[PDB]
Design a protein around this ligand. Sequence first.
Ligand SMILES: Nc1nc2c(ncn2[C@@H]2O[C@H](COP(=O)(O)OP(=O)(O)OP(O)(O)=S)[C@@H](O)[C@H]2O)c(=O)[nH]1
Ligand SMILES: [Mg+2]
Length: 399
Amino acid sequence: VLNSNELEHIHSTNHSVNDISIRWGVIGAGQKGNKEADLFAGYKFSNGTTCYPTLAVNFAESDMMHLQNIIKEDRIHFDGLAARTPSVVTDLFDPETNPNANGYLDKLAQELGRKFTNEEGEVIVDQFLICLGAGGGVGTGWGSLVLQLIREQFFPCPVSMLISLPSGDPDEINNALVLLSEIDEFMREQDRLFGNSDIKPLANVIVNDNTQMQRIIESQYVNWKEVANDNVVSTLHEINIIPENYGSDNVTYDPSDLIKLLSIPGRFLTIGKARIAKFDLHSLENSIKRSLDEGFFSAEHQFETATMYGGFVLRPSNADFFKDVNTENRIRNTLGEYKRLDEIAGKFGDPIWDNEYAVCYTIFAGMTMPKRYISLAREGKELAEKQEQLRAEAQRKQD
Ligand SMILES: Nc1nc2c(ncn2[C@@H]2O[C@H](COP(=O)(O)OP(=O)(O)OP(O)(O)=S)[C@@H](O)[C@H]2O)c(=O)[nH]1
Ligand SMILES: [Mg+2]
């Protein structure tokens, strides 16, 4: 499956795509998470093997049945009863409600053995990628449970969470808020318990905002969710392929650099994918600026709080514009406007590939809570009043 023309152009070109920088183990909870997970499950190497071991987790037999790359065996469901909400979902893994918790919890763990470990016993995975759509019951709940679980040291290795922020429904935007709050707290506890050099149990959290993503999609059938998913998932896959499979005459972003970036900072992380086809300094600047501020991973991030950077421009073989001093400190200065590269750890490469255009990936890690959190807090309470008041204005009229 090839859900971006970058992936198309590097599978027709390159038939040595036999490894990736980080061996993710993907788990998708809730409907959104399931769908993203289903995309990951589809990706294969040039030889035909699957790239990522993937599980789908949900409430119901029902929820999971139109998946395409996830075998039925790997569709894990947990009978519920009752209200579908983040809090009563968490509490099915807590004998504080279910006598079935110590079984339920020792079921998940034996589907963790089966899918991400060998016959031998050893784990076949560097970190877990947990996909969620904040707002729903099942997804948001799983989010909280995961925080709780990684404090039980339930997982063999670190956990990266790919979380999506809800569009506009006061119940959803409140659910989303309590999760994002739980995350901010956990990240602050993690900062006091682990060194700046140590591997963090919560590797990072990557957010997308559903409002920002729709805005974009209606500019460039038309299911917007299906398209949003293709973009975020294909982007993460791309940045995982590239360091393992291409290098540079000037500066290579290797897989170790990417692993450090995703492993150590342990807070909020963002990505900017910018296509480039004008080979000049202005169109370069805008593309980068646009991908960072008005792209799929933009949620009014606090770039000044970034503790690490990474990135690379995949460029054509002839292209000696991207080596150049202007070009280099132009990028250095363009990215410099967000966080001054001189003040934070990182590296920025320029790999070669068999194509005649260039794509520029930018990653900032270690950031603090994104400002979308505040504007959501605002926008949820704003539409909350609107609807309570509507309610009353309808009841008034009747009476
Ligand atoms: N970006 C994106 N968001 C989605 C997609 N599907 C659902 N969402 C969004 O994510 C949030 C939760 O959706 P969903 O995945 O259906 O929750 P859920 O876990 O299944 O919640 P539940 O009520 O059954 S218990 C909502 O804000 C919804 O708009 C998707 O495919 N892409
Ligand atoms: Mg659902």
